Design a protein around this ligand. Sequence first.
Ligand SMILES: NC(=O)[C@H](Cc1ccc(C(F)(F)P(=O)(O)O)cc1)NC(=O)[C@H](Cc1ccc(C(F)(F)P(=O)(O)O)cc1)NC(=O)[C@H](CCC(=O)O)NC(=O)c1ccccc1
Length: 287
Amino acid sequence: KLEFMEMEKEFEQIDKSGSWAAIYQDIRHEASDFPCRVAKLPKNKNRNRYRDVSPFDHSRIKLHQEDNDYINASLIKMEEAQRSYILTQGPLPNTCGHFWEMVWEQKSRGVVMLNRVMEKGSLKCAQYWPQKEEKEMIFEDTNLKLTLISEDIKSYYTVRQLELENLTTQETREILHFHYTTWPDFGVPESPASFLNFLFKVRESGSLSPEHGPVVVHCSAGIGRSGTFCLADTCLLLMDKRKDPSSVDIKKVLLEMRKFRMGLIQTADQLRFSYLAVIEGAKFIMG
Ligand SMILES: NC(=O)[C@H](Cc1ccc(C(F)(F)P(=O)(O)O)cc1)NC(=O)[C@H](Cc1ccc(C(F)(F)P(=O)(O)O)cc1)NC(=O)[C@H](CCC(=O)O)NC(=O)c1ccccc1
């Protein structure tokens, strides 16, 4: 209703007075800090992509293995909004089996990729899915088979259809892979419009449905771009749900979210672009 005028205003105050970096640093200093012991054990040294990016022990996702259950991935559970995600780092060459085992055990329907294999001459993620078309892989360590099916490629993102099979029980599931292809690490999406459109493909696929396991979201470290993606999603939910959409405190929500995984949203501009995308995408949603 009228409410929508309260957000652009509020957003403008912040923009003109460039108070973004300040707010971001406030959010930082305030962030929760819980222990990541398990992440630091010697046996899990090579199951991590970066030394400074770890899952809190209170919310890390545990693999159903008797020997080693570690994977660098956290479970973000937003009560009010009633939505959950699994944020994880881009898989390692030796961690691909684990990734798909987690998808299977957690009953996820969709996987959202916000980064790229090739990012600045460096490998930021392993090729954990079939490329050609009709290409088929197999993960010996976890007993899973993965098969390419569909692949609508576009200018800012790609949607693939995959068939994941449990080789032990021969049970198969369809997994949808949403890959945003134009999001530089520490940069922002090509435009709010392309971003939102993307979030909508994802939402409308039912992959975010609560009758399913949490969608798996990741980038390279699984905190910057992913945090931005989920913050936006959650906030848009809160708006649709509350009588008055404005009462949504983006800062409060991100701090709540950061209780489950460290460093969600890495720059002051990712925070900004996050207010924007929520505000903009708020148009269609709230009507
Ligand atoms: N800070 C950093 O940039 C990244 C994390 C990162 C990356 C991307 C993002 C994102 F926002 F882009 P995303 O979308 O993925 O969320 C966020 C955070 N960190 C890092 O890059 C840290 C930097 C570092 C080095 C040494 C030290 C130490 F000497 F002090 P030590 O006591 O720990 O030994 C501490 C930190 N690096 C690393 O942890 C290992 C090198 C250290 C090692 O294992 O020996 N590097 C890589 O894994 C790597 C992988 C692919 C291509 C190139 C590099």
